[PDB]
Structure formats: structure tokens, C-alpha cells
Amino acid sequence: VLSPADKTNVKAAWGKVGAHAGEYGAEALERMFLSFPTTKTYFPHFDLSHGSAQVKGHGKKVADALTNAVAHVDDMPNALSALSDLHAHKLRVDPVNFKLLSHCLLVTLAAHLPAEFTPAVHASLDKFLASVSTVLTSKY
Amino acid sequence: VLSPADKTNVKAAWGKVGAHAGEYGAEALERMFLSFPTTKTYFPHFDLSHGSAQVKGHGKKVADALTNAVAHVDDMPNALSALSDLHAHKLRVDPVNFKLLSHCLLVTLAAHLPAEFTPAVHASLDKFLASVSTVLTSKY
Amino acid sequence: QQYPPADESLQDAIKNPAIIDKEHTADNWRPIDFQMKNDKGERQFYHYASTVEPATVIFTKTGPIIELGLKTASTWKKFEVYEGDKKLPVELVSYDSDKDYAYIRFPVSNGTREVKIVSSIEYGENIHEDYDYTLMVFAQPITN
Amino acid sequence: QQYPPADESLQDAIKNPAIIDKEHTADNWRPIDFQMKNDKGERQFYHYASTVEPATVIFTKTGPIIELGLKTASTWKKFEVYEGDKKLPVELVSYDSDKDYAYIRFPVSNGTREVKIVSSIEYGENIHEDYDYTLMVFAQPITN
Amino acid sequence: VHLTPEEKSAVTALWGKVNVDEVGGEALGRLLVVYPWTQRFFESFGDLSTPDAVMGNPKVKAHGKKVLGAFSDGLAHLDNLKGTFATLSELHCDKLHVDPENFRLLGNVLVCVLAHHFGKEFTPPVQAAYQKVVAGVANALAH
Amino acid sequence: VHLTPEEKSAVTALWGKVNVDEVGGEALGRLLVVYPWTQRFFESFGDLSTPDAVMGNPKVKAHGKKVLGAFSDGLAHLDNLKGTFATLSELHCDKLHVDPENFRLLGNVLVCVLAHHFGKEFTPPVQAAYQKVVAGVANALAH
Numbered sequence: 055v056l057s058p059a060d061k062t063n064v065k066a067a068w069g070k071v072g073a074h075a076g077e078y079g080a081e082a083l084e085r086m087f088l089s090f091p092t093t094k095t096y097f098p099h100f101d102l103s104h105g106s107a108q109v110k111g112h113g114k115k116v117a118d119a120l121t122n123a124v125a126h127v128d129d130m131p132n133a134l135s136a137l138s139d140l141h142a143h144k145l146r147v148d149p150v151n152f153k154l155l156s157h158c159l160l161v162t163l164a165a166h167l168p169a170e171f172t173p174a175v176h177a178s179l180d181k182f183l184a185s186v187s188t189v190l191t192s193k194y
Numbered sequence: 195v196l197s198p199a200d201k202t203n204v205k206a207a208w209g210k211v212g213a214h215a216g217e218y219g220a221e222a223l224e225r226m227f228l229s230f231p232t233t234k235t236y237f238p239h240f241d242l243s244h245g246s247a248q249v250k251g252h253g254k255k256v257a258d259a260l261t262n263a264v265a266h267v268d269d270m271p272n273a274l275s276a277l278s279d280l281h282a283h284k285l286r287v288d289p290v291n292f293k294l295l296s297h298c299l300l301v302t303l304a305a306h307l308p309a310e311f312t313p314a315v316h317a318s319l320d321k322f323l324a325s326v327s328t329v330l331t332s333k334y
Numbered sequence: 335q336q337y338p339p340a341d342e343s344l345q346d347a348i349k350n351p352a353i354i355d356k357e358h359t360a361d362n363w364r365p366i367d368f369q370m371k372n373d374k375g376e377r378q379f380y381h382y383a384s385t386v387e388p389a390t391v392i393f394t395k396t397g398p399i400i401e402l403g404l405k406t407a408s409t410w411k412k413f414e415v416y417e418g419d420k421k422l423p424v425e426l427v428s429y430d431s432d433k434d435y436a437y438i439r440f441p442v443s444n445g446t447r448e449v450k451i452v453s454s455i456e457y458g459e460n461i462h463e464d465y466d467y468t469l470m471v472f473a474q475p476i477t478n
Numbered sequence: 479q480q481y482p483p484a485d486e487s488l489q490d491a492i493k494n495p496a497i498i499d500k501e502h503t504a505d506n507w508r509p510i511d512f513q514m515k516n517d518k519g520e521r522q523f524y525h526y527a528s529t530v531e532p533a534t535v536i537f538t539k540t541g542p543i544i545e546l547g548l549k550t551a552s553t554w555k556k557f558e559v560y561e562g563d564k565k566l567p568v569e570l571v572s573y574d575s576d577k578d579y580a581y582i583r584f585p586v587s588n589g590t591r592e593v594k595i596v597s598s599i600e601y602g603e604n605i606h607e608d609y610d611y612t613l614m615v616f617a618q619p620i621t622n
Numbered sequence: 623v624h625l626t627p628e629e630k631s632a633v634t635a636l637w638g639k640v641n642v643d644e645v646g647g648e649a650l651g652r653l654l655v656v657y658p659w660t661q662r663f664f665e666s667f668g669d670l671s672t673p674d675a676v677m678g679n680p681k682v683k684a685h686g687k688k689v690l691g692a693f694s695d696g697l698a699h700l701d702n703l704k705g706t707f708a709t710l711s712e713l714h715c716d717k718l719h720v721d722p723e724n725f726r727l728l729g730n731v732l733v734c735v736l737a738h739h740f741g742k743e744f745t746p747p748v749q750a751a752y753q754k755v756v757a758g759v760a761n762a763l764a765h
Numbered sequence: 766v767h768l769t770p771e772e773k774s775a776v777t778a779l780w781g782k783v784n785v786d787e788v789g790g791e792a793l794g795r796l797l798v799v800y801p802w803t804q805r806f807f808e809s810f811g812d813l814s815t816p817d818a819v820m821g822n823p824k825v826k827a828h829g830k831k832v833l834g835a836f837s838d839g840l841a842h843l844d845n846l847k848g849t850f851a852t853l854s855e856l857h858c859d860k861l862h863v864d865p866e867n868f869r870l871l872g873n874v875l876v877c878v879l880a881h882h883f884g885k886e887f888t889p890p891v892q893a894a895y896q897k898v899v900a901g902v903a904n905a906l907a908h
């Protein structure tokens with residue numbers, strides 16, 4: 055459950071990401087596949103080599119979905135309805151994998167936006183990503 | 195995130211608990227302390243012997259809070275605000291302990307209300323208790 | 335354009351685009367508390383859990399109207415309201431799509447203290463439950 | 479009974495009990511889409527994220543009024559709106575306590591296509607950020 | 623698993639009353655419904671679209687018996703869980719890629735099914751004994 | 766921890782550039798702010814009411830250095846993490862009663878601080894190497 059402060063931290067920080075959101079999304083996935091190779095089993099249709107056109111393309115879709123989620127953080131279930139259908143109903147993704155992508159996203163943001171990645175912002179982003187993960191992994 | 199079906203399952207099932215809610219709350223705690231003795235460190239002020247007047251009394255407060263949470267399942271953060279203050283801000287309870295009490299509550303409900311404890315109801319109650327736990331363990 | 339009455343199937347009446355996310359504030363109105371009781375004198379938990387408190391008494395020239403917010407609208411089936419013995423007309427004035435709340439209205443007599451509810455829920459894999467009796471007891475007698 | 483203007487400190491104006499959970503639906507109104515843009519021509523993300531879309535054009539005899547829902551109201555500080563060069567009066571008509579949404583209104587001229595916003599946020603342990611320029615571009619020119 | 627002789631006697635006594643043909647299907651069935659992502663691992667079993675479909679699935683029932691029997695083997699060799707579940711651990715890790723956390727979930731679901739079956743007989747001291755057993759099996763599979 | 770000689774070289778090379786006086790305080794500080802329940806274990810440290818208070822707390826900084834040094838000891842004895850962290854495992858389990866899941870959290874926070882410090886230099890292949898190290902240390906403490 056996000057505080058008003060948490061929501062503000064996330065929105066303000068994500069605004070500073072901007073046009074590079076697709077770049078970070080791509081990099082977070084690359085990190086996840088390398089660090090946690092069991093996550094690759096969800097993308098057997100992908101060529102999971104480094105600099106993969108599919109991974110770069112998928113990163114942009116993941117970033118655009120996170121952007122949508124941040125813009126509707128007050129009511130994510132309604133906003134991410136089709137995405138919950140995909141991940142929870144169809145893919146049946148194990149929640150443990152969302153913790154791994156979330157951590158990789160935080161790693162990427164810390165590396166690229168160190169001035170913005172304060173302790174307070176870190177806290178709010180981790181909390182936000184955990185809420186997104188619950189929504190995408192729940193059948194509602 | 196609860197579906198309309200999940201909310202209905204929980205409300206209907208909890209209505210069949212009724213006046214015995216305080217009895218189950220007490221029993222769930224007894225089970226938690228015995229099964230998971232590290233949870234006893236949160237109640238050093240209690241006499242944690244079996245049939246403890248404090249544990250029986252506390253079970254009723256826990257049951258009344260769960261009843262309140264079920265009645266306001268659509269917006270638990272606002273309903274459980276003071277309870278989040280206690281558990282998240284003051285007590286700083288580790289989220290792992292909420293999973294343990296939740297499981298013990300499910301064990302108690304299964305033992306006392308077997309006709310009501312169907313697979314679908316089980317699913318919704320586990321999901322509900324997980325949402326209550328997130329609220330009580332978050333600083334918002 | 336024709337949908338089932340809120341009386342018979344609330345979960346079907348809420349699909350009507352004419353009342354989805356429609357404004358429904360009255361000119362003259364008052365908040366009123368209430369309790370839901372079952373046949374054994376206990377609190378009727380499902381209905382307490384599934385209703386917005388306080389309700390609203392709306393003043394009109396044809397008599398006082400009670401507005402009640404019902405939660406999990408897509409799970410309610412029957413929701414008949416009786417003043418003593420006689421059946422009241424139940425109208426769905428608005429459905430909140432974002433939180434699945436339905437706002438229904440029914441007229442009561444002046445000095446009405448209680449109203450009887452006969453209702454059911456129907457959802458999921460053929461799950462069906464009847465609540466043959468619930469008593470909505472108002473905090474004060476309804477006036478104006 | 480006197481609170482700060484929504485212009486100067488929205489987070490303080492929302493504490494006014496006169497507007498907490500107050501009804502605010504108009505007689506004649508129309509939904510209107512919009513975009514929030516920054517000084518570099520990009521989407522101004524914080525404001526897009528922090529506003530309810532669509533907004534509402536309310537028709538009155540004194541001219542068209544825009545109603546905008548602002549999210550995380552308790553975090554907003556300054557929220558000044560300018561039509562071209564001249565500063566507009568910003569009124570807080572309602573605050574939704576349950577979701578921390580503030581609904582503000584400001585009058586615009588007929589055929590107004592864009593409005594300028596100068597605003598800031600202030601919260602937590604002395605966290606303060608200024609948004610010196612945001613352009614609210616309407617989907618169509620405002621009429622009536 | 624460090625169980626006192628009294629706990630072993632209480633655990634063994636109730637396990638002899640367990641309907642082995644039924645309890646395993648209910649535990650596995652409930653795992654799939656309560657924690658729906660687990661259905662991904664059992665997609666070869668067929669129709670898992672609804673609760674009624676899962677609980678009535680003969681392959682869920684058949685496999686549930688295998689899992690119970692695995693727990694029955696665990697009640698023996700209580701001082702050597704790691705060695706006995708070694709072959710199963712390698713299967714679930716290398717071939718199936720199941721996350722360790724899920725082993726604890728199934729263990730806790732089995733306990734709920736035991737309470738569902740035995741009711742008041744499934745007392746808190748007895749549950750406490752079974753919690754040690756299911757935690758031991760989970761850890762053994764995670765090893 | 767099963768690391769290839771290239772991974773050991775990459776891990777050791779970046780660890781030599783680590784500001785040991787600072788990185789440990791930032792990791793522990795962020796653990797307490799991001800996962801606020803962890804403050805309960807460090808209530809002897811004093812004021813932990815705000816982020817600025819935690820990061821500026823000299824006892825958080827002092828203890829953070831102990832934790833980093835513990836990780837530095839872990840970079841040696843990579844084929845024997847269980848034995849080296851045995852004494853610490855017993856402390857965190859028997860005396861402090863810390864849940865194993867929290868060890869993974871702190872490990873992941875350290876990795877975020879490393880990315881925060883090194884930026885683009887903290888490449889995905891390097892992170893992958895550090896993930897194995899932090900997972901190894903976490904498991905060792907949980908043993």
C-alpha cells in the first residue's frame with residue numbers, strides 16, 4: 055500500500071526517466087535473463103542472445119506498461135486488466151519471477167539515475183513494483 | 195487483488211463464522227505460538243501458556259479486526275489505518291509472521307467449518323488474508 | 335435498451351449503459367445510519383459487509399426515498415425490499431464501474447423504522463445462496 | 479474557517495471541512511480530453527500521472543469553466559493556472575478523502591485551446607520540486 | 623526433523639487414519655486453485671480452468687497419491703530427509719524448475735487438508751508436529 | 766558458489782574499487798528504509814524514524830562496515846561459505862531470530878548500492894556474478 059509520498063516519489067522519479075524508459079526496460083530484462091537464467095524458460099520463443107531485437111522490443115512494451123501503471127497507480131487493477139489476464143490467467147507466471155525483474159529494474163535505475171535514486175525514492179519504487187507484481191499475478 | 199467472486203466468497207464464509215469469530219481468533223493464535231515459536235517474541239508481555247486469558251482476549255480483538263477488514267474489503271487501507279500504525283510503524287512486525295498467522299487461521303477455519311471450507315473459498319480467504327497482511331505491514 | 339429490474343437481477347441491471355457511472359446527487363437529502371439484522375436477531379454480516387453506511391434519505395414531493403449503496407453488485411441477484419408486507423419498487427439509479435458499487439432507491443412511508451430485504455447472490459461456478467430475511471433497521475424513523 | 483487558496487497551497491486548502499467529500503456535479507457539462515506537455519515538447523509525466531482524464535467543461539452564464547481532478551492532493555503545493563499571460567482564479571470545490579483527489583475549477587475564454595500551469599509539490603522530509611511550466615492542451619477548443 | 627518420541631507417536635497415529643486415496647488429490651487440487659501459477663507445471667494434466675475441473679481431474683487425483691506416498695516415505699527416514707528426497711529435489715530443480723517457496727505452500731496446504739479431514743482431532747500440538755515434518759520435507763526438496 | 770575464473774576476476778576487480786567505508790552504511794541504511802520492519806532488529810541503534818536519520822546514523826554506518834567486511838571475507842572462502850558464516854548464522858538464528866528471507870533482501874540491496882556507485886561499469890555480466898555471491902552468502906547464513 056503506497057502512501058501519498060510514495061506515489062509522488064514514483065511519479066516524480068519516473069518523469070525523469072522519460073524517453074529512456076524503453077532503454078531501461080530492455081536493460082532490466084537483459085540483467086534478469088543473465089542473473090536468473092530460470093526466467094528464460096518463459097521466453098523460449100525469443101532469441102535470448104545479448105542485443106536481441108525481441109528483448110529490446112519487449113523492454114519497450116514492459117516500460118510502456120510500467121509508465122501506464124505509474125500514471126494510474128491509485129487504481130492499477132482496472133488499468134492493468136489485460137496485463138493481469140496475460141500474466142496471471144494465460145502465462146501463469148510464478149510471483150518469484152516478478153521479484154527478480156523488479157530488483158533488476160531497481161538495479162538499472164540506480165545505475166542510470168543515481169541523483170534520483172535516493173533511499174526514499176528506492177523505498178517507494180520497490181513498494182510500487184511489488185504492487186504491480188501482485189496485480190499482474192492475481193486472478194481478479 | 196480480490197475478484198468480485200473472491201470478495202463474495204469471503205463475506206459469505208465469514209458470515210457463517212459469526213459469534214464464534216473470537217473463538218477461532220484465539221485458536222489461530224494458540225496454533226501460531228505452538229507451531230512457530232519465534233512469533234512468541236512479539237508477545238513477551240503475555241503469559242503464553244495454553245488457555246491464557248490474554249491470548250483468548252487478544253484473539254477476540256484480532257477476530258473483530260478481521261471482521262472489520264472483511265466488511266470494508268474494497269478499501270482496507272482507510273479502514274485498518276490505526277492497525278497499520280500499530281503493526282507497521284510501532285511494532286515493525288516482519289511480514290513472514292503474517293503468513294504464519296494467516297495459515298493458522300485457515301487451519302482453524304478448515305477444522306471448524308469443513309462444509310464452508312471449499313477449494314474456491316480457501317483460495318479467496320488466502321488471498322484476502324494476504325491483502326490484510328500487506329496493509330498492516332505497509333507504512334502509508 | 336430493456337434490462338432486468340434491480341429487484342430480480344441486480345448483476346444484469348448494472349450492465350445498462352444509461353446508468354453506468356451516472357451522476358445521482360439529490361437537491362435535498364440527509365445521511366441516515368442503519369443496521370442489518372438476520373432472523374436470529376444477530377447482525378446479518380453479508381449485508382452489513384455489502385452495504386455503504388451511511389445510507390441517504392432523499393426528500394421528494396411523493397415522499398421520502400432511501401438510497402442504498404450495494405457492494406459487489408455483479409454478484410447480487412435478487413434484492414427485493416418490503417415495507418411491512420407490501421413490496422416496494424427498487425430502482426437502479428447508478429453503477430460505479432471502478433469499484434462495482436450499485437446505488438438503488440426505494441420509497442418508504444413517513445415514520446418508517448425498518449424495512450425487510452429478501453435477496454440472493456449468484457456467481458462463479460454455479461454458486462448460489464439465498465438470504466430469505468434481512469431486516470434493515472434505521473437509526474431514526476424516516477421523515478419528510 | 480479561512481483556508482489558503484488552492485492556487486498557493488492545495489494540500490492546505492483540502493483540509494477545509496466545507497469541501498471535504500462535497501457533491502460537485504453540474505447541470506450542463508461535457509467531458510473533454512487533454513494533454514500535459516513540458517517545456518521541451520514532451521509529455522509532462524508528473525501532471526499526466528497526477529490528473530484525472532477526461533476533465534469536465536462546465537457551462538455557466540459567466541462563461542465556460544474547466545473542472546480538473548488532481549491526484550495526490552496532499553502533496554501538491556502551488557498550482558497556478560494562466561490563460562495566455564493573465565492569471566486565472568482557481569477554486570477548490572471538492573476533496574475526495576478516500577483517494578486523496580482534489581477537484582479544482584477555473585474559468586476560460588471561449589475558443590481557448592491551451593492553458594499554462596505553474597506548480598510545485600512539497601512533502602515528506604523537506605522534499606520540494608518546482609514545475610515552472612506545464613501546458614494543458616485541450617483536445618478541442620472550449621465552447622459555451 | 624527434530625521430533626520428540628511423543629510427537630512421532632502423535633504424527634504416526636493420525637497418519638494411519640488418513641484416507642491416502644483422497645487427501646493427496648485434495649491437497650494438490652487445492653494447491654492449483656489457491657496458488658494458480660502452480661497450474662503451469664501441471665499443464666500436461668489437461669483441464670485446469672475451474673475449481674470443479676481441477677478437483678475432479680483424475681490425473682490430479684492420481685498424482686496427489688504419489689505426493690502423499692512421498693510424504694509417507696518422509697515419515698520414515700526423519701533423520702535423513704535430505705538423502706531420501708535427493709532424487710526428487712534434482713527432478714524439481716533441474717527438469718521442472720520449481721521454485722523452493724512452492725514446496726512450503728504445498729506443505730501448508732496438506733496441513734489445511736488434514737485439519738479439514740480430522741477437525742477438532744487435528745489439535746494445535748498435533749499441527750505443530752506436522753509443521754516440523756512439512757518444513758523438513760520442503761527444506762529437503764530445496765536442498 | 767560456483768563461479769568461473771573470469772567471474773572471480775571481474776568480481777574481485779570491482780570489489781577493489783569499492784569505497785568500503787561508505788557502501789556498507791548505504792546498503793544497511795537502505796535495508797532499514799526500504800524494508801522498514803528490519804528497523805526492529807536495530808532498535809539499539811537509536812533514531813530510525815526518518816530516512817535522513819537512518820542514513821546519517823553513525824551506528825548504522827559503523828555496523829554497515831562490519832557487514833561489508835563480512836562480504837569481503839565471503840569473497841575469500843567461496844567454496845566454503847557454510848563453514849565461514851556458521852558462527853554468524855547461529856547468531857542471527859538463535860539470538861536475533863532473523864528470518865532467512867531478510868538475508869536475500871540485504872544481498873539485493875547491496876547489489877543496488879553497487880550499481881548506484883559504479884553506474885555503467887556495473888554491467889549485466891558483472892551483476893550476474895554478484896548475484897551468485899549474494900545468494901551464496903544468504904544461503905550460508907540460512908544454513
Ligand code: HEM
Pocket residue numbers: 093096097115116117119120137140141145147151152155156186187190
Ligand atoms: C514489471 C512487471 C511486468 C510488466 C510491466 C510486464 C509487461 C508485459 C507486457 C506489456 C507484455 C506484452 C503484452 C502484449 O503485447 O499483449 C508482456 C508479455 C509477456 N510477459 Fe511480462 N511483464 C512483467 C513481468 C513479467 C515477468 C516477471 C515475466 C516472467 C519472467 C513475464 C513474462 C512475459 C512473457 C513470456 C510475455 C509474452 C512475450 C511476448 O509478447 O512475445 N512478464 N509483459
Ligand code: HEM
Pocket residue numbers: 233236237255256257259260277280281285287291292295296326327330
Ligand atoms: C491477521 C492479521 C492481524 C490482525 C487482524 C491483528 C490485529 C490486532 C489487533 C486488533 C490488535 C490490538 C489493537 C489495539 O488494541 O490497539 C493487535 C495488536 C498486536 N499485534 Fe496484531 N494482528 C495481526 C497480525 C499480527 C502478527 C502476525 C503479529 C506478530 C506475530 C502481531 C502482533 C501484535 C502485537 C505484539 C500486538 C500488541 C499486543 C497487545 O495489545 O498487548 N499481530 N493486533
Ligand code: HEM
Pocket residue numbers: 660663664666685688689692693710714718720724725728729759760763
Ligand atoms: C513437498 C511437496 C512435494 C512433494 C512431496 C512432491 C513429490 C513429487 C513426486 C513423488 C513426484 C512423482 C515423480 C515421478 O513421477 O517419479 C513429483 C513430480 C512432479 N512434481 Fe512434485 N512434489 C512436491 C511439490 C511440488 C510443487 C510445489 C510443484 C510445482 C508447483 C511440483 C511439481 C511437480 C511436477 C510438474 C511433477 C511431474 C508430474 C508428471 O509429469 O507426471 N511438485 N513430485
Ligand code: HEM
Pocket residue numbers: 803806807809828831832835836853857861863867868871872902903906
Ligand atoms: C548477508 C547479509 C548479512 C551479513 C553479511 C551480516 C553480518 C553481520 C555481522 C558481521 C554482524 C556483527 C556481529 C558481531 O558483532 O560480532 C552482524 C550482527 C547483526 N546483524 Fe547481521 N548480517 C546480515 C544480514 C542481517 C539482516 C537481514 C538482519 C535483520 C534484518 C541483521 C541483523 C543483525 C543485528 C540486529 C546484529 C547485531 C548488531 C549489534 O547488536 O551491534 N543482519 N551481522
